[PDB]
Each structure stands twice: as structure tokens, then as C-alpha cells.
């Protein structure tokens, strides 16, 4: 299936003319992964923009955060431009400082993801990364075929010897899976292009001990997963899923055994050691900064909170202790440093409409809410 990109543009800090800041563009909900994203200043692409490593969500749809240092002024216009197969022409979302542009059992998860993009018989690409929940802990350098340790504690309690062995295994695996798929696909060219995603790792749920998983998607839909010792086809992907599970269950018992030990024995060890080593960083508290803005629609009042970590937060418009319903909660969006951003909108009538305020509540604030008066 294909999914059109969602595009959201925001600044890391409140805009102050002449003062340096970061411009962020979050591109999400898209499929396939092939995408072009630029940040524009007055219609011209900014060089030396950075971006997060390609990731994807629960529904397999891809997400990327683009960011650059910028200095807003009164006059300068910034935007995010995206092109993608779902779009007949590039889509430009402007940054507006006033309004921007655009589960159950509690658990932690360590997992590796892979994205395999098969463009044609002569061209395929494998990429991947490691994640503690939504935090990236590991990258993968394609050229050298090596693990990139992103944090000082990214080795968990694993030895360099163990990590080197895993690294070599992953290198052989990425190359081999890509080639094996290309060999099957070279017998019918009209299947091209297509994409394969893997998510594999282990989860610690409250009340349970670690559980491994290995999940696969094809063109953005569940294809199959590893259940106990059996590759099980997604009910959703019918005949192709059945074929692939038959291959995996009957011609690759060595692969099966390797996946089993990795997700059921090595991954739990890795997860527990990683949480432990990264304790201080993962359970840190970072206070949000907060500010108000408005635009005409009747005003929209907009309350912003940016720079908070961890993610749970509560932001609401209040008319003297009365919480205003009619408040639109935006998405919680990432900043490049791992903190988060949120705006909350209230549509109002009249002028300055007596005592409106915005209340920001967050674990980091030591029981002292930020209250901003309009």
C-alpha cells in the first residue's frame, strides 16, 4: 500500500527575531520510504540540514525528523518541502510562529528495525537501527557494515567480544537477506518496486518477564511473524504470506534456531543491561519552556510547551480553575535532542476575553505548574 506523508513544522524554542533557534520538520505516516525533504529559506533549500535515522511506527508507516539551525527575522520565510510518490508535485508547508505549519500493559522494548528497499533487479538497499522504545540507541553504517553506538551506555553490560560477534552476524544477515529476496524477485520483474520491513527484539511488560518477537511487513502491511518456533502468516496477506512462511518453516531451520536464541535469550540479556547502564539518561527530567501566541480564525489562542522529557504531559486552557472544553490538543512532536513539543489551541470570541490562562503540568516541574496568562 502507499501512504501520503504528514508534514508538521515547528521551532524548538519560541521565535525571537534575531535569535538563533532550530527549525523542525516532522514527516510521518508515509509509505514507501523513498522521500525527499528540504527545509527552505525564502523558497531556497538550506544545505547542511540534519535528519533522524529512518524509523517507523506500529502501523509500519515511516517517520523522519528534519532540523536545522535558523535565525528568524520579521521578513524571512521558512518552509518544509516534501516530495513522494503519493504526491503529484512537491508539498510545501510554511512555518508560522503563531500556529506552526501542519496501549495497555506498560512496557519497555529493545528492538532492531530493518528496511529493505527493492527498486529493481539491479538495485536494493538494506538499512537499520536499534531502539529503546522511541529513543534511538544504535545506528548502522552501511559502508563499513558496523554498529554505531549512539550513547556512552549503548553497550549495556555486553562485552566488546559479544558485540563484535553480533555485528558480524548482522552484516552477513543484511547482505544475505537482501540477496535471497533479489534472487526470488528476479524471476518476475513486475513486482518491483517493493519494500520489506522487519522489527525484531524483546519487550519487558509490567508483571511479566521478557518476551521476544520478530515481525515482518511487505509494502506497509503485516506479512508474517515468529510465534514460538513457527513462522506464522498474517491472516491479512493471504497467499504470498503462506508461501514465505512455508519456505521459512521448511527450508531454513538454521535461521529459525538463530532467530529463537537472539530474541528469547540474547535480547533479554541485552535489554536488562541497557536499561541499567542508561538509567540516568532514560529517567532524567527536563523542564519544558512554555509560551502563548495567537492568530485570527474570533481568535485562536495557542499554548506551546517545548523541551520536556519524559513524554507524559498535561496542558490545558483554564478560565479560573474551570478547564475549557473546546481545547484542541495537537500531536506530541519530537525535538532533535530527544525532548518533545506540544501546542494546544483554544478558539475564542470577543477580544482579550477576561482571565484565560494555560496550565502546563509535567513531572519535571516539582509540583509547580507553569501558568501563562493571556
Amino acid at each position, epitope marked *: 500500500i502507499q501512504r501520503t506523508p504528514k508534514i508538521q513544522v515547528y521551532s524548538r524554542h519560541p521565535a525571537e527575531n534575531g535569535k538563533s533557534n532550530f527549525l523542525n520538520c516532522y514527516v510521518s505516516g508515509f509509505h514507501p520510504s523513498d522521500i525527499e525533504v528540504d527545509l527552505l529559506k525564502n523558497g531556497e533549500r538550506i544545505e547542511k540540514v540534519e535528519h533522524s535515522d529512518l524509523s517507523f511506527s506500529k502501523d509500519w508507516s515511516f517517520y523522519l525528523l528534519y532540523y536545522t539551525e535558523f535565525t528568524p527575522t520579521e521578513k524571512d520565510e521558512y518552509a518544509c518541502r516534501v516530495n513522494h510518490v503519493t504526491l503529484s508535485q512537491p508539498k510545501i508547508v510554511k512555518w508560522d510562529r503563531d500556529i506552526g505549519g501542519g496501549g495497555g500493559s506498560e512496557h519497555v522494548s529493545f528492538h532492531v528495525i530493518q528496511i529493505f528497499s527493492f527498486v529493481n533487479q539491479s538495485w536494493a538497499r538494506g538499512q537499520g537501527s536499534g531502539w529503546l522504545d522511541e529513543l534511538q540507541t544504535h545506528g548502522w553504517d552501511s559502508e563499513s557494515g558496523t554498529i554505531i553506538f549512539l550513547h556512552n551506555w549503548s553497550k549495556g553490560n555486553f562485552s566488546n567480544e559479544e558485540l563484535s*560477534d553480533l555485528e558480524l552476524l548482522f*552484516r*552477513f544477515y543484511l547482505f544475505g537477506l537482501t*540477496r535471497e529476496i533479489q534472487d526470488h524477485a528476479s524471476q518476475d520483474y513486475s513486482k518491483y518496486p517493493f519494500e520489506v520491513q522487519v522489527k525484531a527484539g524483546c519487550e519487558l511488560h509490567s508483571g511479566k518477564s521478557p518476551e521476544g518477537f520478530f515481525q515482518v511487513a511487505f509494502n506497509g502491511l503485516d506479512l508474517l511473524s515468529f510465534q514460538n518456533t513457527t513462522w506464522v502468516p498474517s491472516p491479512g496477506c493471504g497467499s504470498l504470506a503462506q508461501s514465505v512462511c512455508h519456505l521459512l518453516n521448511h527450508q531454513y531451520e*538454521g535461521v529459525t*534456531e*538463530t532467530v529463537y*536464541n537472539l530474541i528469547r535469550s*540474547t535480547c533479554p540479556r541485552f535489554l536488562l543491561g541497557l536499561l541499567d547502564a542508561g538509567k540516568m539518561y532514560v529517567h532524567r527530567q527536563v523542564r519544558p519552556e512554555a509560551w502563548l501566541s495567537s492568530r485570527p480564525s474570533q481568535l485562536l489562542l495557542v499554548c506551546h510547551a517545548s523541551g520536556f522529557y519524559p513524554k507524559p504531559v498535561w496542558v490545558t486552557w483554564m478560565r479560573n480553575e474551570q478547564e475549557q472544553l473546546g481545547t484542541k490538543h495537537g500531536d506530541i512532536l519530537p525535538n532533535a535532542d530527544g525532548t518533545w513539543y506540544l501546542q494546544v489551541i483554544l478558539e475564542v470570541a470577543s477580544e482579550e476575553p477576561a482571565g484565560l490562562s494555560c496550565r502546563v503540568r509535567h513531572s519535571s516541574l516539582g509540583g509547580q505548574d507553569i501558568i501563562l496568562y493571556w
Partner: T-cell receptor
Amino acid sequence: SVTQMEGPVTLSEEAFLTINCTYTATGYPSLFWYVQYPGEGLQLLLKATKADDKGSNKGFEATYRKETTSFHLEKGSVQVSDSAVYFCALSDQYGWGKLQFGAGTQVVVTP
Amino acid sequence: TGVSQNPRHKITKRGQNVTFRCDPISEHNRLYWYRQTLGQGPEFLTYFQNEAQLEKSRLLSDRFSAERPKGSFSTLEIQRTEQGDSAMYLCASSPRTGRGAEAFFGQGTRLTVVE
């Protein structure tokens, strides 16, 4: 990653053969013995891909013992045609890696 | 039937380049070069998966280079041979039959570098 007994080991036809091999590994290696007869290339004798698996061939055996990290070669009653060089080996990367060989042990079986 | 290496023997003067060839069992995706000196175990030199050289020994001299252009035959070249290069150069290949797959060895190329 693989240490084996220094030879040569000389023994009489029908004597018991033991060649010690110990390994060091963090992961899930596959273990093996290769043999090289005089004038010949290397060839697999036997192997074991997991803890407690036993490989056996022509009276030789070796048991993968994870807790002593060992894969000792044994044969109850050696024959003259067993005169050769024996190499302990391991494949890391969960049994997908290159063979890493010990230094080898010459066995001389006298008639 | 098995892995084929050429030449079976090579005598060369110190300073000259040599190239050796391996033809693995066809259909084997994994190919490995090793060096063995009299009375010792093979030392790993390099590994190909198909055409891709996915692992080289950290100790491999910069004088040594291998290639496997079509995921089939491979060549090992030694530039400016030295006496210490004298050894049996082994090629082996393995199928993807699973964990602990058998490696099939050639009869080797015996190199003697003479003054």
C-alpha cells in the same frame, strides 16, 4: 578462541585417543574437528552445533560441553589409518561465521 | 567434485607478484581464504559472501588482495612477495545448509618465496 593439545601424540594401535580442545565464546558457536591425512587436504571429521550435541565419525566422538567450554576428541581404539593431523575448530556468529582453527595435533598410530 | 585451486605449487623470487585462483563448489555462496604454514592450523585471511568481501583479517598484509568478481571463482594476489609469505594458501567454500555448515577445502597452492 580455540586452544587444543600440543602434539605429536604417539600411541599404539588399539590404545585410547584423547585430544583436548577448549574454546572461548560469548555467543552460540558451532564446534568441529577437521582431519588431514598425509598427502591430503583438510576435511570435516565431525561437528556439534549446540550445547550437549555429540558429533561422531568412524569411532571418534566429541561432545559440546558448554560449562567446561570443551569439545574433547576421543576414540576408544585407534587404528593405524588414524595417523593424521586433527584440528579443533569453531564457527562464531551463531554458527554462520568463518572457521577458527586450533594449532592442530599430529597423531602417530604405531602398528 | 570438490574445491579446485591453481596453481598447485608456485616458486617465485622475493619481490615478484603472484596471483592464485580458486574455483569453489558452484552454488556455494560462502568462500574463504586461509594460510597454513607447516605444522600449524590455518589462519583466516578473508571471506566472500557472493561477490561481497564482507570480512577481512585485521592482520592481512596490504600486499594481499582478493576478489571474487561474479560470486564464483576468486583470485588472491600477493604483491612484492617476502620469504614469510611462504605457506600453503587454502581456499574453502560452504553452502547455506544452516548453522555449523561444512567447509569444503581445496588442495591448496603451496608458495615458496626464494632469495
